[PDB]
Amino acid sequence: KEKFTSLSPAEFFKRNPELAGFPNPARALYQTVRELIENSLDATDVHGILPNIKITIDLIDDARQIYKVNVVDNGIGIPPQEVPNAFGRVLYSSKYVNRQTRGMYGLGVKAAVLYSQMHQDKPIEIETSPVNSKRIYTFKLKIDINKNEPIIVERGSVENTRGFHGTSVAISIPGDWPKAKSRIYEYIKRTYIITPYAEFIFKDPEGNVTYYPRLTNKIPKPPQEVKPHPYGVDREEIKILINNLKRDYTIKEFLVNEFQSIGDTTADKILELAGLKPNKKVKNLTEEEITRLVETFKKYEDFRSPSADSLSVIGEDLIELGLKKIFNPDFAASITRKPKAYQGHPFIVEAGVAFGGSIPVGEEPIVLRYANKIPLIYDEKSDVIWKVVEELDWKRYGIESDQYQMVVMVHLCSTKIPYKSAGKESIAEVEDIEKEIKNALMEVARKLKQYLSEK
Amino acid sequence: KEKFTSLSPAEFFKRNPELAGFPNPARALYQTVRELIENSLDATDVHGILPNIKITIDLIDDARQIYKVNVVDNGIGIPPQEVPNAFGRVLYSSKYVNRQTRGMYGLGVKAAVLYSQMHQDKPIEIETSPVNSKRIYTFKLKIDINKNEPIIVERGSVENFHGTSVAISIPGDWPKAKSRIYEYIKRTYIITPYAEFIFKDPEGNVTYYPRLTNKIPKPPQEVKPHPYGVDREEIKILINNLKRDYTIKEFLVNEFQSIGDTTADKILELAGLKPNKKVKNLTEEEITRLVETFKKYEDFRSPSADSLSVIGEDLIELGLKKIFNPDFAASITRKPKAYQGHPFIVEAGVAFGGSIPVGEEPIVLRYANKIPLIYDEKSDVIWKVVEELDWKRYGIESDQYQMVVMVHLCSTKIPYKSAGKESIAEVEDIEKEIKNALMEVARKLKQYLSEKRKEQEAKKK
Ligand SMILES: Nc1ncnc2c1ncn2[C@@H]1O[C@H](COP(=O)(O)OP(=O)(O)NP(=O)(O)O)[C@@H](O)[C@H]1O
Ligand SMILES: Nc1ncnc2c1ncn2[C@@H]1O[C@H](COP(=O)(O)OP(=O)(O)NP(=O)(O)O)[C@@H](O)[C@H]1O
Ligand SMILES: [Mg+2]
Ligand SMILES: [Mg+2]
Numbered sequence: 015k016e017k018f019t020s021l022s023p024a025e026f027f028k029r030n031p032e033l034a035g036f037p038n039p040a041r042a043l044y045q046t047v048r049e050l051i052e053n054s055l056d057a058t059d060v061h062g063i064l065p066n067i068k069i070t071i072d073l074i075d076d077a078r079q080i081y082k083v084n085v086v087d088n089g090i091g092i093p094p095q096e097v098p099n100a101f102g103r104v105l106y107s108s109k110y111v112n113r114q115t116r117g118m119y120g121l122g123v124k125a126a127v128l129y130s131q132m133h134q135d136k137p138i139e140i141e142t143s144p145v146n147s148k149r150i151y152t153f154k155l156k157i158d159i160n161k162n163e164p165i166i167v168e169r170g171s172v173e174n175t176r177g178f179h180g181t182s183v184a185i186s187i188p189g190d191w192p193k194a195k196s197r198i199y200e201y202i203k204r205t206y207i208i209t210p211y212a213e214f215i216f217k218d219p220e221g222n223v224t225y226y227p228r229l230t231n232k233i234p235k236p237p238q239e240v241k242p243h244p245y246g247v248d249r250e251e252i253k254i255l256i257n258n259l260k261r262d263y264t265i266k267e268f269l270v271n272e273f274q275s276i277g278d279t280t281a282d283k284i285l286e287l288a289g290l291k292p293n294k295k296v297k298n299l300t301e302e303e304i305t306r307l308v309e310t311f312k313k314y315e316d317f318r319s320p321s322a323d324s325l326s327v328i329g330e331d332l333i334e335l336g337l338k339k340i341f342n343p344d345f346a347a348s349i350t351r352k353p354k355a356y357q358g359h360p361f362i363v364e365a366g367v368a369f370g371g372s373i374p375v376g377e378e379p380i381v382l383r384y385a386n387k388i389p390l391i392y393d394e395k396s397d398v399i400w401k402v403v404e405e406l407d408w409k410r411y412g413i414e415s416d417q418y419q420m421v422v423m424v425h426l427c428s429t430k431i432p433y434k435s436a437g438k439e440s441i442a443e444v445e446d447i448e449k450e451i452k453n454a455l456m457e458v459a460r461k462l463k464q465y466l467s468e469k
Numbered sequence: 470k471e472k473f474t475s476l477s478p479a480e481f482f483k484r485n486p487e488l489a490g491f492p493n494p495a496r497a498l499y500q501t502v503r504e505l506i507e508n509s510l511d512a513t514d515v516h517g518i519l520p521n522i523k524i525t526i527d528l529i530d531d532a533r534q535i536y537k538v539n540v541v542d543n544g545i546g547i548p549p550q551e552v553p554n555a556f557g558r559v560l561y562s563s564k565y566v567n568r569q570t571r572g573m574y575g576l577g578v579k580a581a582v583l584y585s586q587m588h589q590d591k592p593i594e595i596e597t598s599p600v601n602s603k604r605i606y607t608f609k610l611k612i613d614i615n616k617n618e619p620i621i622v623e624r625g626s627v628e629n630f631h632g633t634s635v636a637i638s639i640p641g642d643w644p645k646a647k648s649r650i651y652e653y654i655k656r657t658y659i660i661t662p663y664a665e666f667i668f669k670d671p672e673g674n675v676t677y678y679p680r681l682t683n684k685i686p687k688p689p690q691e692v693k694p695h696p697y698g699v700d701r702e703e704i705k706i707l708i709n710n711l712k713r714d715y716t717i718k719e720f721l722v723n724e725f726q727s728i729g730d731t732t733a734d735k736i737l738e739l740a741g742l743k744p745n746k747k748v749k750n751l752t753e754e755e756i757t758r759l760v761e762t763f764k765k766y767e768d769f770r771s772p773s774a775d776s777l778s779v780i781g782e783d784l785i786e787l788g789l790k791k792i793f794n795p796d797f798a799a800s801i802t803r804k805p806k807a808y809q810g811h812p813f814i815v816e817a818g819v820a821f822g823g824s825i826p827v828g829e830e831p832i833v834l835r836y837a838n839k840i841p842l843i844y845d846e847k848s849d850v851i852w853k854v855v856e857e858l859d860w861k862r863y864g865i866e867s868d869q870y871q872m873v874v875m876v877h878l879c880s881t882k883i884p885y886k887s888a889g890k891e892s893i894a895e896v897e898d899i900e901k902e903i904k905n906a907l908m909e910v911a912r913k914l915k916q917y918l919s920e921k922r923k924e925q926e927a928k929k930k
Contacts, residue, residue, distance in 0.1 A: 016545070016563035017563055017566060018551050018554065018555065018561065018562070018563045019561070019562065019563070019565050020554075020558070020560055020561050020575075021560040021562075021565065021575060022560075023478055023481070023560070026478070026560055026574070026575075028702055029565075029882075030574070030884075030885075032884045032885070032886060032894040032896070033885075033886075033887065033888060037884060037886075037894040037895050037896055038895055038896060038897055041895065078761055090471070092471075096473050099473065099475075100473065103475065105475055105476045105477070105478070105481055106473065106474070106475045106476075107473070107474065107475075107476070108471035108472055108473045108474070110474050110476060110484075111472060111474075119481075119485070120475075120476060128702075131701060131702060132700040132701050132702045132703075133700060133701065133760070134701075134757060135701070135753045135754055135756070135757045159702060248587035248588060249586065249587055249588065249589075250483055250583070250586055250587045250614055251587075254480075254614065254615065257615070301590050302590055305589070305590050308588075309533070393848050395847035395848065396845050396847060396848035396892075430484075430485075432485065432487040432492065433485075433487065433488070434487060434488075434492075434845075434886075434887055434889075435488065435886055435887040436488060437886075440848075442487040442492040443492050443493055443496065444487070444492055444493060445493055
C-alpha cells in the first residue's frame, strides 16, 4: 500500500545533499568555502564596503577527516534576531529581492549545516556585530530538520566598543583537502583577479598562508533592488505582485508603478494591445485577462531597456587587465553589452578573448566562466557558455589551424542567474541568454578577426 | 537595508524552474511526458500490474505553441482525498519510503504544474479510479504558489475500470524535443517488455509498442537501511520512529539489514556502547561514534539483492542486439553494494561491431532505476568513468571503433545532480563500482576481440 507523506525543505535537502553541491566530501569542502566567501562578499561590496576577508581551513580530526572552515569578513553583520533563521532555516534569505547578488536561494549555508550535522556533532559558530551597537553576538546553532527551524544552542554577547563590524562563521564537516586543493585555490584566485578592491588572506589545512593584496580603493557602484522588467514576466509573477498590493490600484497604475520601462504612453499602448482598461481594478483580473497581459508583454516591441542600477559588471578594463596578467597574450579584447531582460530579469553578458604569448597550444579554447562575479569551476561541459563557445566557428574569425592558443571568457550577470543545480556550478539552457552570449562572443571574435588579419 | 524573507517550496521552484528540468519549452515538453510516464510505471509495475500506458500530445494553440499532454494508465489509481496534495503540494509523495521507484522527490508532476501555471490558463485535470472502486473521480486543480497548497477548481465523481489519466497543458517546442521523446519511449520500451505503450504525437503519428511477455519482474519492496553509510540524522529518525523501547543491541539487529547478534556485539564494542542501554537515550556524541563505526566496519554482509529491481543480463544483451545488431554483446548483473545506507546494483553491458556506427568514442547509454537518461551526459559519473578507462587495454586497436556501452544504476536512492533527474552525481562508492562493472564486461570484450584476431591470423598464415 502506498503511504503518502510530506517533507519540510530541510528534510528534502538532507535526503538529497547532492542537489545542493554536497555529493562527496571533496566537493563538500569546496562548496562550503565557496558559500561562506560568497556570503562575506555579498555582505560587503553590495553595501559599499571594501571587503576584508579571512579564510581558514584546519584539519581537526584526522581519522574521521573533519575539517573546520572559518570565514571572517568586515561586512554589515546580521541583526541578532535574524541569526537563527539566516543560518538555521532552509529557504530564508535577504536576497529574494530583485537585485544582483552572488546568493539567491536562501539555502547555501544551511546546506553546509545539514551536511555538517549528518556527519559530526559540533554546532556551527557565528559571531556578528552589525553596523551599529556596542555588542558582538555569538551563536551556536543546529537545524531541527523535521520542523525546519533553528535550535539555539549557545547565545551570548559582549561589549566590543571599538568599531568592529562583520561576521565570523565556522562550520565543521567531512572533507578531502588533497582532492579539493587545486579547485579551492583556483576559486579564490579567479575571485581575486576580478575583485581588486578586496583583500583576502587564506590559510590552508597544511598551514600555507596566502595573501591577496587590495590593489585599488575604488568600489563599483553597489547593485540595488529594482522593479521587474515587463518582458517575460509570467502569470504567477503578475498575481504575486497583485496580492502584494496595499491599495486597490487600477490596471494602468499597476503597470506604471510595478514595472521598469512603463510610463503613461507605454501603459496606454499596453492596455490596448491587451484589450484591458486603464481604470479597472487590477485585483479583479481574470485568469484569462492575466494571460492577455503576459502575452502582450512578450510581443511588445518598444520597451526601453532595463537600467544598469540593478547589475554590477566587471568591466572591459578589468576583464582585459585580468586576461593579460594571467596569460600574457599577444592580443586581448573585451566587451560589456548593454542590459537585456529575460523572464522579467535584467541581465548583461560581458566577454573577453585572449589569443597569444604564453597561452598553451590546444585543439579547443580555454573557457573561463563567471556568473554574478562568481568563478565557475565544475561541470563546464554542461554549461550553456560552453555550448555556445563550442558552436562558434573560429575558422572564420581568423583561427586557421585546428590548433590554436585562445582564452575565451564569459561573464553573465543578472538579478537571477538560472543555474542547473542549487550547487551553482553551471548555467542552464535559457534561450534569451544563449542568444545574448552568442552576441557577446561574436563582438569579441570580430575584434580578434581584425587582429589576426592585421598581424 | 537587508530584508529577510522565507519562501515555500512551491515558490522556490516557481522562481527557479530550471532546477527541476524546465529551463526551456523544449526541455519542458520532454520533462512533462517523462514525469507522467514514470508516475504511470510506478503506479503499475511496482504493484504487480502489467502496464498499459497511452501517451498523447496535442497542439491546442499553434500561435502560443501550447500543447496538451495526456498520459493514461491502468495503474492503482489515487485515493481521492490524496489527489489534491499528490498533484498540488510540492514535497508530497508516496515514495519517500526506502524502496526502488522511479520517483523520489515528491516534486515531478508539481514542477510541470508550476510551469503550466506560469504560462497558461487551464488547470491540470486528473481522472482516477483506485483499486476496488465503484467511482471514477475527476479533479481540476491549481497550486497556490505562495502557500504551497492545492486549489481545487473542479471536482466530481461518476459511477464506474482502474487507473489514472492526467492531462496538463504547457508551452512546448515539439520539433526540438521530438527525437528525444521518441528515444525516451523506445528506450524504456526495450527494457520493459511486459509493458504496452501507445504514443500519439502532435502530428497525428501513432506508434504502438506491444507487450512481448506476460512475465513481470518481482515488485521492489520497502526495506531496512543497510548500516554502511547511515548518517547521524538518519539514526535520529530511526530512533524517533521506534514503537518499542529497544536496547541499543535490539536497535542494531532489528532496524538494519545485515546485522545479526554477533555483528551487533562486534559493533557495540567497536563503538564503546553498552548493549543494554536504551537507544532512546543515545547521546549526540554516541550517535557520531556509531555512525563512524558503521562507516569503518569491514565485515558487513551484502545488502539483500531481493530489495531492488534489475533489468537482468538477458534483457540487456537482448535489447542491445535488437537496437544495434552488433557482432558481439555482453553484460553483467553485479552483486549488491551499499552507499550511504542505500542498497544499489550496477548493471553493465557492451556491444561491438556490426551496425554500430564508427566513431572515436563509445556510444554511452545510461539508465537509472529503469529510466533511460538522455540529457546532460557529460555531467554524468557514468560518462566520467567511461572516459577514464583506457579501452586500448581491453582489446580495442584504432582511434575509431564500433562500440556501445550500457550502464544501469538501480537503488533505493539515485543520487541525481538535479531535481530534473538527467545525470547521476559523483558518489564515490558508486563511481568505484561502475568502474568495476565496466571492467567486468570489458574483460568479456577482450576475450571476443582476441578470439577474432587469432581467427584472422589463422587464415592469413
Ligand atoms: N557573512 C555574512 N554577513 C552578513 N549576512 C550574512 C552573512 N552570511 C549570511 N548572511 C545572511 O544569511 C542569509 C542566508 O545565507 P544563505 O543560506 O547562504 O542564503 P543566501 O546567501 O541568501 N542565498 P544562497 O547562498 O544562494 O542559497 C543571507 O541571505 C544573508 O542575509
Ligand atoms: N498515474 C499515477 N498513478 C498513481 N499515483 C500517482 C500517479 N501520478 C502520481 N501519483 C502519486 O502522486 C505522487 C506525487 O507524484 P510526483 O509529484 O511525481 O512525485 P513523485 O513521483 O513521488 N517523485 P518525483 O517525481 O521524483 O518528484 C506520487 O508519489 C504518487 O503516489
Ligand atoms: Mg549564500
Ligand atoms: Mg513522479
